[PDB]
Amino acid sequence: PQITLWKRPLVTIKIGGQLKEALLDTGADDTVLEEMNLPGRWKPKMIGGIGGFIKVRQYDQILIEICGHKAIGTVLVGPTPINIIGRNLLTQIGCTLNF
Amino acid sequence: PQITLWKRPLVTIKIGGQLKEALLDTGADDTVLEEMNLPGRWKPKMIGGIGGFIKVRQYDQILIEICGHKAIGTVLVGPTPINIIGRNLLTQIGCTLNF
Numbered sequence: 642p643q644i645t646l647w648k649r650p651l652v653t654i655k656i657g658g659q660l661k662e663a664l665l666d667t668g669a670d671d672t673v674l675e676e677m678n679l680p681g682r683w684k685p686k687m688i689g690g691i692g693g694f695i696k697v698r699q700y701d702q703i704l705i706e707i708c709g710h711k712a713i714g715t716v717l718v719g720p721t722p723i724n725i726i727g728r729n730l731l732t733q734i735g736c737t738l739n740f
Numbered sequence: 741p742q743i744t745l746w747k748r749p750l751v752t753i754k755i756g757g758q759l760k761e762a763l764l765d766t767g768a769d770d771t772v773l774e775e776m777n778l779p780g781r782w783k784p785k786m787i788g789g790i791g792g793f794i795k796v797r798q799y800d801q802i803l804i805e806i807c808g809h810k811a812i813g814t815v816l817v818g819p820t821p822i823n824i825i826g827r828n829l830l831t832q833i834g835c836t837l838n839f
């Protein structure tokens with residue numbers, strides 16, 4: 642689809658068999674989701690945003706469906722202000738900026 | 741033009757007679773630029789993201805040229821690690837997300 646930016650580009654995602662709302666964030670290198678239980682192994686990592694660095698749990702090769710488009714990649718889980726879909730997955734669903 | 745997301749969507753902008761590189765950020769509600777000495781009045785503001793909040797100065801009706809597309813609106817200025825073009829100006833240049 643073509644999404645305008647007058648409102649936040651929020652979409653429904655499916656991860657770990659659970660539906661969630663997430664923000665399409667072209668300014669994020671990585672995908673960061675709020676606290677949740679994800680199956681499989683994970684390692685602790687650090688990620689930095691506009692206000693500093695937080696601690697997250699890194700999940701690799703996680704299946705995640707974004708607005709009907711499947712992707713398999715890295716998902717970081719931690720105290721982010723909002724679920725964000727970053728470029729590591731936006732590239733997988735073929736997402737581009739156009740003007 | 742069309743911009744893929746393999747790398748950060750950095751583009752050249754023109755503000756207050758200065759050329760800078762800035763991130764086209766669909767996750768940012770409002771444009772925030774690295775510290776710079778703009779003239780005119782402003783109102784304090786705090787914006788939040790990963791890591792917490794930073795204090796910024798809100799300037800209104802600031803003219804910015806993004807990839808030759810002229811825009812005018814709110815521009816925040818503060819200790820951001822990177823220049824960020826937010827939705828408040830992305831809409832004005834006709835920018836959409838597509839997949």
Ligand SMILES: CCC(CC)CN(C[C@@H](O)[C@H](Cc1ccccc1)NC(=O)O[C@H]1CO[C@H]2OCC[C@H]21)S(=O)(=O)c1ccc(N)cc1
Nearest residue numbers: 668669670671689690691767768769770772787788789790
């Ligand atoms: C609340 C929704 C997001 C945070 C989740 C808002 N951010 C824009 C976001 O694109 C930010 C913009 C940003 C980019 C780079 C450095 C600081 C901020 N990128 C970001 O935090 O991504 C992190 C996760 O992937 C990594 O790659 C980038 C940093 C990591 S922000 O920087 O904090 C921001 C908040 C309010 C305004 N008006 C302008 C910008």
